[PDB]
Amino acid sequence: TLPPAWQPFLKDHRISTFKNWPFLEGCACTPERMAEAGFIHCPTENEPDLAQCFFCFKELEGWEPDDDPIEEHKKHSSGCAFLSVKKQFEELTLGEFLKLDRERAKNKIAKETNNKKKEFEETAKKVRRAIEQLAAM
Amino acid sequence: TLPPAWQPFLKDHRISTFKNWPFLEGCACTPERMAEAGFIHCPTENEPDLAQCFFCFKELEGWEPDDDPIEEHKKHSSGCAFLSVKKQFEELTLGEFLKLDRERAKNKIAKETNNKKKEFEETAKKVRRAIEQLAA
Amino acid sequence: ARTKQT
Amino acid sequence: ARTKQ
Ligand SMILES: [Zn+2]
Ligand SMILES: [Zn+2]
């Protein structure tokens, strides 16, 4: 019985996001191992195997059955602090937990601002080009 | 940034409930010491100094300036598990914290059912008196 | 302080 | 697995 916003810190919540995950028993990147590694399932029509770390917000697709989710998390987002968490959720102190939730919020913000920066720069390219075209004739 | 329902476990939230508490510096039952002891300020028009333990829901009024809130909590609700909590809030484990919140929820239910018992018995008294009056 | 009544 | 783009 925990607030929706904190659910993703719980392994069982993360497992439960995996609706129609294609890699089941026999495979290394099962729901159990994806969740153990921090991922939740964020499928689209386009990107049906899409997964995201709840903590650092890295988004990975193109999963292969032999992929070890933890190694993939390490390779693709090595600064992620969730990877450092050795203790079970209930063995954390509230101070530790609050320190973690603050870093998560900062990660979320950083991701959102990184997105805004790329969208802006793309708009800037369109405006620039259009002005250049006009000055030509 | 914690959920409204859990705020009362934080000392600073509890202190902030004390709006116009009359016992300030010089007194033993200050806002700081009330909050340290578990209380929040639940004033009414009727009962302006009313305070309640956020954890066991015991409600005390008639505060005097020399009242040590912790001693008062002990006297009036000795079974309250918040009194046993030795560690600071942030030193608790989540497991410990969740154990505590479960006890708080049970205390809430118990209190609500004690209140219902008191209302029922009061209605029964009114019914009784009215029947007696009618028989005469 | 004292228990509150009705 | 690869990043999204
Ligand atoms: Zn991560
Ligand atoms: Zn209490």
mmCIF file of C-alpha atoms and ligand atoms in Angstrom:
data_model
loop_
_atom_site.group_PDB
_atom_site.id
_atom_site.type_symbol
_atom_site.label_atom_id
_atom_site.label_comp_id
_atom_site.label_asym_id
_atom_site.label_seq_id
_atom_site.Cartn_x
_atom_site.Cartn_y
_atom_site.Cartn_z
ATOM 1 C CA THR A 1 0.000 0.000 0.000
ATOM 2 C CA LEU A 2 2.424 2.719 -1.307
ATOM 3 C CA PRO A 3 1.934 5.939 -3.336
ATOM 4 C CA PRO A 4 1.754 5.474 -7.141
ATOM 5 C CA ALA A 5 4.799 7.716 -7.616
ATOM 6 C CA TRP A 6 6.993 5.358 -5.497
ATOM 7 C CA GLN A 7 5.709 2.050 -6.885
ATOM 8 C CA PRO A 8 8.465 1.865 -9.489
ATOM 9 C CA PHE A 9 11.045 1.392 -6.740
ATOM 10 C CA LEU A 10 9.334 -1.979 -6.045
ATOM 11 C CA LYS A 11 10.460 -4.981 -8.034
ATOM 12 C CA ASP A 12 6.992 -6.534 -8.167
ATOM 13 C CA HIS A 13 5.471 -3.376 -9.610
ATOM 14 C CA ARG A 14 8.129 -3.272 -12.296
ATOM 15 C CA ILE A 15 7.621 -6.924 -13.184
ATOM 16 C CA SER A 16 3.882 -6.262 -13.492
ATOM 17 C CA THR A 17 4.465 -3.618 -16.212
ATOM 18 C CA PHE A 18 5.609 -6.389 -18.572
ATOM 19 C CA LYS A 19 2.429 -7.062 -20.504
ATOM 20 C CA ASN A 20 3.081 -9.350 -23.510
ATOM 21 C CA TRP A 21 6.885 -9.189 -23.172
ATOM 22 C CA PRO A 22 8.171 -11.574 -25.825
ATOM 23 C CA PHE A 23 11.236 -12.958 -23.985
ATOM 24 C CA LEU A 24 10.106 -15.529 -21.406
ATOM 25 C CA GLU A 25 11.604 -18.756 -19.999
ATOM 26 C CA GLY A 26 14.706 -19.872 -21.917
ATOM 27 C CA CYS A 27 15.822 -16.278 -22.355
ATOM 28 C CA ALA A 28 18.220 -14.158 -20.324
ATOM 29 C CA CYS A 29 16.149 -10.917 -20.520
ATOM 30 C CA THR A 30 12.991 -12.212 -18.832
ATOM 31 C CA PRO A 31 10.510 -9.948 -16.999
ATOM 32 C CA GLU A 32 12.032 -11.049 -13.670
ATOM 33 C CA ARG A 33 15.564 -10.049 -14.843
ATOM 34 C CA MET A 34 14.381 -6.804 -16.568
ATOM 35 C CA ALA A 35 12.645 -5.726 -13.396
ATOM 36 C CA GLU A 36 15.624 -6.790 -11.240
ATOM 37 C CA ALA A 37 17.688 -4.437 -13.417
ATOM 38 C CA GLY A 38 15.399 -1.413 -13.038
ATOM 39 C CA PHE A 39 13.403 -1.565 -16.258
ATOM 40 C CA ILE A 40 9.729 -1.109 -16.859
ATOM 41 C CA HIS A 41 7.943 -1.938 -20.081
ATOM 42 C CA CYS A 42 6.907 1.151 -22.096
ATOM 43 C CA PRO A 43 5.674 -0.484 -25.340
ATOM 44 C CA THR A 44 4.286 1.390 -28.329
ATOM 45 C CA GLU A 45 2.692 0.112 -31.584
ATOM 46 C CA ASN A 46 5.998 1.169 -33.188
ATOM 47 C CA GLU A 47 8.459 -0.001 -30.514
ATOM 48 C CA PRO A 48 6.762 -2.995 -28.864
ATOM 49 C CA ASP A 49 9.824 -4.117 -26.857
ATOM 50 C CA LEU A 50 10.531 -0.645 -25.424
ATOM 51 C CA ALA A 51 11.879 -0.562 -21.892
ATOM 52 C CA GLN A 52 12.999 2.257 -19.658
ATOM 53 C CA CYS A 53 14.954 2.466 -16.410
ATOM 54 C CA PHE A 54 12.579 3.958 -13.815
ATOM 55 C CA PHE A 55 15.544 5.630 -12.141
ATOM 56 C CA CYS A 56 17.803 7.116 -14.870
ATOM 57 C CA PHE A 57 15.139 7.120 -17.673
ATOM 58 C CA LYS A 58 17.392 5.528 -20.249
ATOM 59 C CA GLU A 59 15.254 3.917 -22.937
ATOM 60 C CA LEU A 60 16.356 0.740 -24.733
ATOM 61 C CA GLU A 61 14.819 -1.200 -27.565
ATOM 62 C CA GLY A 62 16.068 -3.988 -29.822
ATOM 63 C CA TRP A 63 16.262 -6.527 -27.009
ATOM 64 C CA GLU A 64 17.731 -9.909 -27.940
ATOM 65 C CA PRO A 65 17.014 -13.094 -25.969
ATOM 66 C CA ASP A 66 20.661 -13.526 -24.769
ATOM 67 C CA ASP A 67 20.818 -9.913 -23.507
ATOM 68 C CA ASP A 68 21.634 -9.739 -19.779
ATOM 69 C CA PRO A 69 19.560 -6.691 -18.734
ATOM 70 C CA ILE A 70 22.030 -5.680 -16.020
ATOM 71 C CA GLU A 71 24.940 -5.678 -18.400
ATOM 72 C CA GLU A 72 22.844 -3.705 -20.858
ATOM 73 C CA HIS A 73 21.951 -1.153 -18.174
ATOM 74 C CA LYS A 74 25.634 -0.838 -17.261
ATOM 75 C CA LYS A 75 26.817 -0.409 -20.865
ATOM 76 C CA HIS A 76 24.085 2.063 -21.862
ATOM 77 C CA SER A 77 23.801 4.171 -18.652
ATOM 78 C CA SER A 78 26.827 3.469 -16.393
ATOM 79 C CA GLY A 79 26.257 6.528 -14.171
ATOM 80 C CA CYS A 80 22.853 5.194 -12.976
ATOM 81 C CA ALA A 81 22.832 5.085 -9.151
ATOM 82 C CA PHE A 82 20.199 2.350 -8.963
ATOM 83 C CA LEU A 83 22.918 0.063 -10.199
ATOM 84 C CA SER A 84 24.780 0.800 -6.964
ATOM 85 C CA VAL A 85 21.922 -0.158 -4.726
ATOM 86 C CA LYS A 86 22.914 -3.366 -2.984
ATOM 87 C CA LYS A 87 20.194 -3.510 -0.267
ATOM 88 C CA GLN A 88 16.600 -4.718 -0.613
ATOM 89 C CA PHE A 89 13.968 -1.911 -0.621
ATOM 90 C CA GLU A 90 12.852 -2.479 2.946
ATOM 91 C CA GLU A 91 16.439 -2.546 4.232
ATOM 92 C CA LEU A 92 16.917 1.055 3.063
ATOM 93 C CA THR A 93 16.628 3.817 5.571
ATOM 94 C CA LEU A 94 14.201 6.580 4.783
ATOM 95 C CA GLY A 95 17.181 8.927 4.596
ATOM 96 C CA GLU A 96 18.763 6.640 1.993
ATOM 97 C CA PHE A 97 15.472 6.314 0.167
ATOM 98 C CA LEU A 98 14.855 10.038 0.120
ATOM 99 C CA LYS A 99 18.419 10.607 -1.148
ATOM 100 C CA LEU A 100 17.596 8.193 -3.968
ATOM 101 C CA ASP A 101 14.263 9.784 -4.852
ATOM 102 C CA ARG A 102 15.955 13.164 -5.099
ATOM 103 C CA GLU A 103 18.489 11.809 -7.558
ATOM 104 C CA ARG A 104 15.638 10.267 -9.557
ATOM 105 C CA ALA A 105 13.848 13.620 -9.787
ATOM 106 C CA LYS A 106 17.094 15.271 -10.949
ATOM 107 C CA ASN A 107 17.493 12.558 -13.554
ATOM 108 C CA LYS A 108 13.929 13.163 -14.797
ATOM 109 C CA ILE A 109 14.518 16.854 -15.090
ATOM 110 C CA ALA A 110 17.857 16.327 -16.892
ATOM 111 C CA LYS A 111 16.159 14.030 -19.400
ATOM 112 C CA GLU A 112 13.331 16.452 -20.012
ATOM 113 C CA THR A 113 15.727 19.328 -20.505
ATOM 114 C CA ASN A 114 17.906 17.270 -22.796
ATOM 115 C CA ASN A 115 14.797 16.621 -24.891
ATOM 116 C CA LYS A 116 13.815 20.264 -25.004
ATOM 117 C CA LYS A 117 17.382 21.180 -26.094
ATOM 118 C CA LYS A 118 17.233 18.775 -29.089
ATOM 119 C CA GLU A 119 13.753 19.919 -30.167
ATOM 120 C CA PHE A 120 14.776 23.564 -29.924
ATOM 121 C CA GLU A 121 17.954 23.017 -31.955
ATOM 122 C CA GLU A 122 15.954 21.247 -34.608
ATOM 123 C CA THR A 123 13.465 24.153 -34.800
ATOM 124 C CA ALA A 124 16.404 26.551 -34.945
ATOM 125 C CA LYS A 125 17.761 24.597 -37.949
ATOM 126 C CA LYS A 126 14.438 24.913 -39.790
ATOM 127 C CA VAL A 127 14.178 28.652 -39.155
ATOM 128 C CA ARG A 128 17.776 29.242 -40.205
ATOM 129 C CA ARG A 129 17.440 27.288 -43.401
ATOM 130 C CA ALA A 130 14.249 29.104 -44.354
ATOM 131 C CA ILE A 131 15.883 32.489 -43.835
ATOM 132 C CA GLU A 132 18.905 31.413 -45.884
ATOM 133 C CA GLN A 133 16.599 30.261 -48.683
ATOM 134 C CA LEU A 134 14.833 33.592 -48.774
ATOM 135 C CA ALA A 135 18.097 35.630 -48.887
ATOM 136 C CA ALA A 136 19.122 33.536 -51.974
ATOM 137 C CA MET A 137 16.076 34.458 -54.185
ATOM 138 C CA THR B 1 8.174 15.727 -0.887
ATOM 139 C CA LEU B 2 6.116 13.055 0.937
ATOM 140 C CA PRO B 3 2.450 12.063 0.564
ATOM 141 C CA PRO B 4 -0.031 14.086 2.675
ATOM 142 C CA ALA B 5 -1.087 10.932 4.540
ATOM 143 C CA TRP B 6 2.515 10.379 5.805
ATOM 144 C CA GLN B 7 3.353 14.013 6.670
ATOM 145 C CA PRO B 8 2.268 13.616 10.269
ATOM 146 C CA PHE B 9 5.234 11.277 10.852
ATOM 147 C CA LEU B 10 7.469 14.338 10.267
ATOM 148 C CA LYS B 11 8.236 16.503 13.236
ATOM 149 C CA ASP B 12 8.286 19.717 11.232
ATOM 150 C CA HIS B 13 4.828 19.076 9.792
ATOM 151 C CA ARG B 14 3.506 18.487 13.295
ATOM 152 C CA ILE B 15 5.107 21.671 14.635
ATOM 153 C CA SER B 16 3.464 23.600 11.788
ATOM 154 C CA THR B 17 -0.049 22.514 12.893
ATOM 155 C CA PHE B 18 0.333 24.707 16.011
ATOM 156 C CA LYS B 19 -1.419 27.877 14.890
ATOM 157 C CA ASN B 20 -1.888 30.279 17.772
ATOM 158 C CA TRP B 21 -0.840 27.780 20.436
ATOM 159 C CA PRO B 22 -0.808 29.780 23.666
ATOM 160 C CA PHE B 23 2.138 28.040 25.410
ATOM 161 C CA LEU B 24 5.365 29.421 23.906
ATOM 162 C CA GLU B 25 8.786 30.265 25.278
ATOM 163 C CA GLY B 26 9.035 29.813 29.032
ATOM 164 C CA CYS B 27 6.573 26.898 29.015
ATOM 165 C CA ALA B 28 7.192 23.161 29.033
ATOM 166 C CA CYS B 29 4.442 22.260 26.524
ATOM 167 C CA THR B 30 5.771 24.347 23.586
ATOM 168 C CA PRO B 31 5.021 23.546 19.952
ATOM 169 C CA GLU B 32 8.526 21.983 19.629
ATOM 170 C CA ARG B 33 7.878 19.666 22.616
ATOM 171 C CA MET B 34 4.267 18.863 21.610
ATOM 172 C CA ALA B 35 5.452 17.841 18.197
ATOM 173 C CA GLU B 36 8.391 15.900 19.618
ATOM 174 C CA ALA B 37 5.842 13.965 21.672
ATOM 175 C CA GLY B 38 3.602 13.101 18.675
ATOM 176 C CA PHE B 39 0.872 15.697 18.987
ATOM 177 C CA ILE B 40 -0.790 17.852 16.381
ATOM 178 C CA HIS B 41 -3.040 20.807 17.116
ATOM 179 C CA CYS B 42 -6.708 20.054 16.418
ATOM 180 C CA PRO B 43 -8.340 23.200 17.824
ATOM 181 C CA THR B 44 -12.055 23.820 17.771
ATOM 182 C CA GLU B 45 -14.090 26.869 18.740
ATOM 183 C CA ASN B 46 -15.041 24.802 21.798
ATOM 184 C CA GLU B 47 -11.737 23.204 22.650
ATOM 185 C CA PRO B 48 -9.087 25.690 21.454
ATOM 186 C CA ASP B 49 -6.120 23.932 23.034
ATOM 187 C CA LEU B 50 -7.085 20.484 21.647
ATOM 188 C CA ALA B 51 -4.252 18.200 20.641
ATOM 189 C CA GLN B 52 -4.185 14.686 19.257
ATOM 190 C CA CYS B 53 -1.439 12.031 18.915
ATOM 191 C CA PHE B 54 -1.148 11.429 15.148
ATOM 192 C CA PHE B 55 -0.270 7.801 15.920
ATOM 193 C CA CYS B 56 -2.665 6.505 18.656
ATOM 194 C CA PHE B 57 -5.301 9.257 18.163
ATOM 195 C CA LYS B 58 -5.588 10.065 21.885
ATOM 196 C CA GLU B 59 -7.010 13.535 22.295
ATOM 197 C CA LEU B 60 -6.028 15.794 25.184
ATOM 198 C CA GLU B 61 -7.196 19.218 26.288
ATOM 199 C CA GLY B 62 -6.738 21.385 29.394
ATOM 200 C CA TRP B 63 -3.021 21.907 28.788
ATOM 201 C CA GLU B 64 -1.146 23.746 31.515
ATOM 202 C CA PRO B 65 2.171 25.553 30.926
ATOM 203 C CA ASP B 66 4.208 23.170 33.158
ATOM 204 C CA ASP B 67 2.800 20.067 31.382
ATOM 205 C CA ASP B 68 5.589 17.915 29.897
ATOM 206 C CA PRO B 69 3.846 16.599 26.761
ATOM 207 C CA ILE B 70 5.765 13.324 26.796
ATOM 208 C CA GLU B 71 4.787 12.561 30.363
ATOM 209 C CA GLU B 72 1.233 13.453 29.466
ATOM 210 C CA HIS B 73 1.302 11.120 26.462
ATOM 211 C CA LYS B 74 2.695 8.316 28.661
ATOM 212 C CA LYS B 75 0.064 8.841 31.393
ATOM 213 C CA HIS B 76 -2.904 9.133 29.076
ATOM 214 C CA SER B 77 -2.008 6.553 26.361
ATOM 215 C CA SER B 78 0.796 4.312 27.627
ATOM 216 C CA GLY B 79 0.257 1.636 24.936
ATOM 217 C CA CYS B 80 1.152 4.050 22.132
ATOM 218 C CA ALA B 81 3.969 2.557 20.013
ATOM 219 C CA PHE B 82 5.243 5.938 18.817
ATOM 220 C CA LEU B 83 6.471 6.401 22.354
ATOM 221 C CA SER B 84 8.782 3.427 21.834
ATOM 222 C CA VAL B 85 10.375 4.905 18.763
ATOM 223 C CA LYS B 86 13.947 5.717 19.779
ATOM 224 C CA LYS B 87 15.405 6.464 16.301
ATOM 225 C CA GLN B 88 15.069 9.645 14.252
ATOM 226 C CA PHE B 89 12.586 9.402 11.350
ATOM 227 C CA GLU B 90 15.263 9.164 8.685
ATOM 228 C CA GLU B 91 17.153 6.457 10.544
ATOM 229 C CA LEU B 92 14.192 4.147 10.332
ATOM 230 C CA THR B 93 14.179 1.485 7.726
ATOM 231 C CA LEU B 94 11.305 1.365 5.308
ATOM 232 C CA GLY B 95 10.388 -1.977 6.817
ATOM 233 C CA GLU B 96 10.245 -0.378 10.268
ATOM 234 C CA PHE B 97 8.313 2.567 8.895
ATOM 235 C CA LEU B 98 5.777 0.385 7.124
ATOM 236 C CA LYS B 99 5.336 -1.692 10.293
ATOM 237 C CA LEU B 100 4.575 1.559 12.100
ATOM 238 C CA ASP B 101 2.097 2.798 9.554
ATOM 239 C CA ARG B 102 0.198 -0.464 9.751
ATOM 240 C CA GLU B 103 -0.146 -0.056 13.461
ATOM 241 C CA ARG B 104 -1.353 3.519 12.947
ATOM 242 C CA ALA B 105 -4.079 2.320 10.556
ATOM 243 C CA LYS B 106 -5.234 -0.268 13.103
ATOM 244 C CA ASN B 107 -5.264 2.437 15.786
ATOM 245 C CA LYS B 108 -7.392 4.633 13.545
ATOM 246 C CA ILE B 109 -9.941 1.918 12.968
ATOM 247 C CA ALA B 110 -10.080 1.056 16.667
ATOM 248 C CA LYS B 111 -10.683 4.715 17.488
ATOM 249 C CA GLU B 112 -13.403 5.112 14.875
ATOM 250 C CA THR B 113 -15.123 2.042 16.203
ATOM 251 C CA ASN B 114 -14.814 3.289 19.776
ATOM 252 C CA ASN B 115 -16.484 6.512 18.662
ATOM 253 C CA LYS B 116 -19.330 4.595 16.959
ATOM 254 C CA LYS B 117 -19.847 2.603 20.206
ATOM 255 C CA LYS B 118 -20.161 5.897 22.142
ATOM 256 C CA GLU B 119 -22.645 7.417 19.663
ATOM 257 C CA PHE B 120 -24.767 4.220 19.630
ATOM 258 C CA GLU B 121 -24.902 4.143 23.431
ATOM 259 C CA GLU B 122 -25.882 7.836 23.514
ATOM 260 C CA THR B 123 -28.690 7.286 21.022
ATOM 261 C CA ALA B 124 -29.796 4.305 23.078
ATOM 262 C CA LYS B 125 -29.965 6.568 26.162
ATOM 263 C CA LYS B 126 -32.202 9.039 24.350
ATOM 264 C CA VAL B 127 -34.520 6.284 23.143
ATOM 265 C CA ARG B 128 -34.728 4.800 26.636
ATOM 266 C CA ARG B 129 -35.583 8.122 28.299
ATOM 267 C CA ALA B 130 -38.265 8.870 25.745
ATOM 268 C CA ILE B 131 -39.919 5.463 26.228
ATOM 269 C CA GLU B 132 -39.840 5.892 30.016
ATOM 270 C CA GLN B 133 -41.483 9.314 29.646
ATOM 271 C CA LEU B 134 -44.202 7.855 27.432
ATOM 272 C CA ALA B 135 -44.962 4.887 29.780
ATOM 273 C CA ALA B 136 -45.666 7.382 32.626
ATOM 274 C CA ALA C 1 -3.698 17.955 30.465
ATOM 275 C CA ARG C 2 -6.770 15.676 30.395
ATOM 276 C CA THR C 3 -8.673 13.264 28.159
ATOM 277 C CA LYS C 4 -11.356 15.146 26.277
ATOM 278 C CA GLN C 5 -15.032 14.210 26.881
ATOM 279 C CA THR C 6 -18.613 14.625 25.657
ATOM 280 C CA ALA D 1 19.921 -3.869 -26.956
ATOM 281 C CA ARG D 2 20.348 -0.335 -28.396
ATOM 282 C CA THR D 3 19.254 3.163 -27.376
ATOM 283 C CA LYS D 4 16.068 4.650 -28.785
ATOM 284 C CA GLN D 5 16.369 7.258 -31.516
HETATM 285 ZN ZN ZN E 1 19.081 3.377 -14.779
HETATM 286 ZN ZN ZN E 2 0.147 8.315 20.812
#
